[PDB]
């Protein structure tokens, strides 16, 4: 009764990073076959936790978070790694005892006319709490004049588009991301897959 990792990684549509998706994984044997899951991921790094057959351990819950951002900003998804995405589009805890994986998606998410499905939360009042999310889509009345729910002069919308085009280089090519949070509460661990 293995965990549904195939649903997470090989999903057709990934989420915009601002409304980053989260798939709970519980009550299943999480046998990690990333060494031969038939996909040469750009890179991989387990923060705090280790990938060296640590499957033996039993975790309470595993929250798998998914989204797409630009290669340039692939690093932003790390503990202490401040930036747009970190500060406005999902963030990890400094004590992140979890793995993170991501890869090039230019041949999955780059669209001829530009890809505008993926949106990055540009601005926000405060930095996001770890694993917090915001889907706020309200105009900000920066101006001393109102916005009347429209965007314009000193009246701004809180989102923007990555406009992915294959012509673009590695830096601005779409890169999908999957995160592995390992929860251990008082509830009996539901996932080991030793």
């Amino acid at each position: 009764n293995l965990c549904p990792f195939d649903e997470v990684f090989n999903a057709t549509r990934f989420a915009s990073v601002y409304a980053w998706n989260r798939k709970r994984i519980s009550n299943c044997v999480a046998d990690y076959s990333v060494l031969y899951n038939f996909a040469p991921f750009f890179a991989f790094k387990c923060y705090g936790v280790s990938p060296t057959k640590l499957n033996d351990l039993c975790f309470t819950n595993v929250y798998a978070d998914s989204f797409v951002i630009r290669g340039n900003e692939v690093s932003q998804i790390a503990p202490g790694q401040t930036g747009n995405i970190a500060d406005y589009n999902y963030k990890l805890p400094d004590d992140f005892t979890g793995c993170v994986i991501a890869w090039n998606s230019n041949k999955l998410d780059s669209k001829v006319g530009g890809n505008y499905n993926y949106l990055y939360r540009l601005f926000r009042k405060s930095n996001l709490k770890p694993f917090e999310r915001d889907i706020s889509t309200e105009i900000y009345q920066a101006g001393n004049k109102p916005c009347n729910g429209v965007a314009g002069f000193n009246c701004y919308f809180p989102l923007r588009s990555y406009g992915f085009r294959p012509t673009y280089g590695v830096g601005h090519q779409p890169y999908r991301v999957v995160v592995l949070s390992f929860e251990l509460l008082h509830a009996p661990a539901t996932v080991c897959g030793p």
Epitope: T12, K107, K111, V112, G114, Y116, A151, R160
Partner: antibody, heavy 131, light 113 residues
Framework: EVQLVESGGGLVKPGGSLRLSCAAS????????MSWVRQAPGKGLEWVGR??????????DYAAPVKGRFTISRDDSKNTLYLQMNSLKTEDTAVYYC??????????????????????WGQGTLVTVSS | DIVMTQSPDSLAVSLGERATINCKSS????????????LAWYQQKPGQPPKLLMY???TRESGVPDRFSGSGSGAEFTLTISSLQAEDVAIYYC????????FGGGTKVEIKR
């Protein structure tokens, strides 16, 4: 190449029922938001309906005049689109195109376009609703 | 839905002259979330299917000449052909995709000779 071949148009009695069928080939069919667009003689294009990719839900939308008289279907294993037409009227006499129009702006398909484009239309069969 | 409108209905200019079409929407097709117009232009020669010219209101389809060029934003778009060629004769439709699909009234383009 890619091709969209509509079949099953003709004469049908007023109030009668007719099944249109669009056989698609060349592109990743199941990922595209397929639509029917009709055209009466001399009159302009009019969107009929849309089926989204089954991974994107498979929601159907219909226009105001055909609202709840038509029923869109899909078969991704056979790469074929259907339009079920019921309680037909003399207003409905028109040539019906199946198309990938309105898809690429929302759909999940990437840059590997078959012939370097995405918007494709069929020749479209003529539905005459006369007694 | 959105009432796509076109003007004029008929049009006729000499070879190599300025051919000018317009579009009016009952709503705005400018989506704030990406700042893109969800509008297209379609060329249809009699007896044939429509061919896509323009999408995102500006972007040309592979192989369409620079002759064609769509502009505008929001609810008052326009497609102008710099110099009208013989084959350019056709009816053109401004279809927005912002809300499902709704096509314009139509603008017939003809050559003076």
């Amino acid at each position: 190449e890619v091709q969209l071949v509509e079949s099953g148009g003709g004469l049908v009695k007023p109030g009668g029922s007719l099944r249109l069928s669009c056989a698609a080939s060349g592109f990743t069919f199941r990922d595209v938001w397929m639509s029917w667009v009709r055209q009466a003689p001399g009159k302009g294009l009019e969107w009929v309906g849309r089926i989204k990719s089954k991974i994107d839900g498979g929601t159907t939308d219909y226009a105001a005049p055909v609202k709840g008289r038509f029923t869109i279907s899909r078969d991704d294993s056979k790469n074929t689109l259907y339009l079920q037409m019921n309680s037909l009227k003399t207003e409905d006499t028109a040539v019906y195109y199946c198309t990938t129009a309105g898809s690429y702006y929302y759909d999940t398909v990437g840059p590997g376009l078959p012939e370097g484009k995405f918007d494709y239309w069929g020749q479209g069969t003529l539905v005459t609703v006369s007694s | 839905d959105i009432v796509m409108t076109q003007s004029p209905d008929s049009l006729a200019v000499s070879l190599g002259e300025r051919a000018t079409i317009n579009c009016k929407s009952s709503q705005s097709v400018l989506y704030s979330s990406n700042n893109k117009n969800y509008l297209a232009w379609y060329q249809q020669k009699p007896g044939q299917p429509p061919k896509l010219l323009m999408y995102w209101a500006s972007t040309r389809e592979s192989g369409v000449p620079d002759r064609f060029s769509g502009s505008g934003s929001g609810a008052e778009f326009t497609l102008t052909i710099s110099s009208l060629q013989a084959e350019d004769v056709a009816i053109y439709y401004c279809q927005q995709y912002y809300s499902t699909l709704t096509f314009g009234g139509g603008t017939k383009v003809e050559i003076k000779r």
